[PDB]
Design a binder for this molecule. Structure first.
Ligand SMILES: [Mn+2]
Ligand SMILES: [Mn+2]
Ligand SMILES: [Mn+2]
Ligand SMILES: [Mn+2]
Lengths: 169, 169
């Protein structure tokens, strides 16, 4: 059976995937870099994956309004606003924000992964995490094309180096 | 030729139609009342009409990001946020917000209409205004079905009474 702590996790990650989807849709509409469109689609997939677990356990969905920018947990509302403002400044700032979101997601997925023994919850979280590593590699390579790079904020320097020095999974 | 004042008008109204489109899309996603979907479509039409004038005179479009909730003029950013927060409380509050937006739009269209002699600008503004009267009648009738009604905020009491006591145009 699912624990209250495990429920709290799925609730947070349901909106964390939405944060990434929403920022990326917003930055695509701004800068029309295909990367944002492509990855926003992948985030929609991830949102769906978490929703399927929510439904499986009949947990109330925090997403009561699918509209871009709308969140139940204000942690994500504040992150949405701060990150779109940053990302509006330049193509490089928007790509840095992509890398930032993925950085936070990988750190948060690690957090929740380490609090559960449920194999169906782990498979989804591991798959989400593999996705976020792929996204991080894609955003950084793009920052490289602009003559830029990324400094990690949430995961360790060492984890960041392992991600970017390997090819996409 | 177009005046700087006339340009300022089209710039404001381009984002004012977006405000209505965006709040209505957001409230539809919340409450799934068809009225919001239907009228949001009409606002997309109105947005397009203003854009066609912007392009005709090669005025820079204030809409640099079509994403819901994004505005160049912060008057509309603040209105977007305040109105979605209000509209999230209940179906009746959301319908009151529809009526409010239309109220403001009719008042603002009257303002700009009275500052121009350009027939192509007037035709569009008159057509927009006829649209907003239709929308206001639809939102109020819906509030009536909920046992509610609307108090005008921007247009006069007398103008509000003329609108709602006539049938849709
Ligand atoms: Mn994801
Ligand atoms: Mn991602
Ligand atoms: Mn309109
Ligand atoms: Mn309207």
């Amino acid at each position: 059976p699912i624990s209250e702590e495990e429920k709290e996790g799925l609730i947070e990650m349901r909106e964390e995937e939405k944060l990434a989807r929403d920022v990326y849709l917003t930055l695509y509409n701004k800068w029309k870099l295909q990367i944002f469109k492509n990855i926003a689609e992948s985030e929609q997939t991830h949102m769906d994956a978490v929703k399927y677990l929510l439904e499986k356990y009949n947990i109330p969905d925090p997403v009561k309004n699918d509209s871009i920018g709308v969140f139940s947990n204000p942690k994500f509302e504040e992150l949405y606003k701060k990150l779109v403002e940053k990302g509006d400044k330049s193509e490089v700032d928007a790509l840095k924000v992509g890398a930032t979101i993925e950085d936070l997601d990988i750190a948060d997925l690690e957090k929740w992964i380490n609090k559960t023994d449920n194999e169906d919850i782990k498979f989804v979280y591991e798959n989400l995490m593999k996705g976020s590593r792929n996204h991080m590699r894609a955003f950084v390579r793009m920052l490289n094309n602009y003559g830029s790079n990324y400094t990690p904020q949430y995961i360790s320097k060492e984890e960041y180096e392992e991600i970017i020095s390997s090819s996409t999974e």
